[PDB]
Amino acid sequence: FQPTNGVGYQPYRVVVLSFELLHAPATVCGPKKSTNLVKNKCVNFNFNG
Amino acid sequence: YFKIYSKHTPINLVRDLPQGFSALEPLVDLPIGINITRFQTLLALHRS
Amino acid sequence: EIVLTQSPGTLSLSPGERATLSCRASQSVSGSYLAWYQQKPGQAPSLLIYGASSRATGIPDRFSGSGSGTDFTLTISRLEPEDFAVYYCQQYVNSPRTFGQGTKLE
Amino acid sequence: VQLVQSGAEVKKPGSSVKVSCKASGGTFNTYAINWVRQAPGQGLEWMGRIIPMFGIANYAQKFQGTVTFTADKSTSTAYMELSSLRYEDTAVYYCARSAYYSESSGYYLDYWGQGTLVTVSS
Ligand SMILES: *[C@@H]1O[C@H](CO)[C@@H](O)[C@H](O)[C@H]1NC(C)=O
After folding, report:
1. How many domains are there within chain C?
2. In angstroms, what is the span from residue B38 Cα to ligand 1's centroid?
3. CB–CB of D43 and C100 under 8 A?
4. Which residues are glycosylated (chain B)?
């Protein structure tokens, strides 16, 4: 790789991420988009499933 | 799913299995999904 | 609106060598929605390439794209006298199919 | 495959004109037709596209209200109407092909016509 060169001849760092979709172990998960609490009114609740 | 449940208890005996009641609370749940039909233990030995 | 600027405006100067015609855009060209065109004087433009590097029917593979992101390359491997013509770019990303200003104009 | 273009128009300023791009068989239904200005001694500007099956024409912000696109399903001919000849409207209009589809997302100009020269005179 040379500093003054075409981008085709310039470095690209590649970080290949492999993710299998069975998800039975589920070792890595997203934040899961927790909302806020709105008590004192009838609401459809879903605390932790 | 592999479930390992653990508890600790102080005792004051020389050789027995203590009587009484003790509930073993959960510790960890490994989601491994492999067949297990054989198990073994691992000790430690002293040397000098 | 994604403007395109061709960088070598008159690098050719009746070129006898391989070229490195370029195009750059304000927002990166998404999914290689670019094309090149051959506008021989006194005649209409002829498609030279689509996608990033995909060649064209009746156009030799000596014409070679080499772009990604800010898609920027048209490379004449062995230069021939008849192929001289102002070369244009055009992007199908968001833009109302806008064109560049031409790189091989006398 | 061949998209012959109308001849040069002798249009005095303010006088309207309509170009006549002629599609070969099988060109209109499968493919869209698009118009580029190609102003004299200058670059290429995309006026808009004609979908000749669903009669859909969409124009760029610059040319909106100044040009009208029409196409004839029978006789397979493409037309572009200039509202009036403004002084800068002198140019060499070109009609070309397109994809206007999903599976083929390359919306490039497949085949270009000869071109029509509009001016104050000839
Ligand atoms: C466990 O044994 C079953 C027997 O039917 C087999 O189908 C499965 O593939 C085995 N799993 C592993 C991880 O060896």
Report:
1. 1
2. 14
3. yes
4. 35
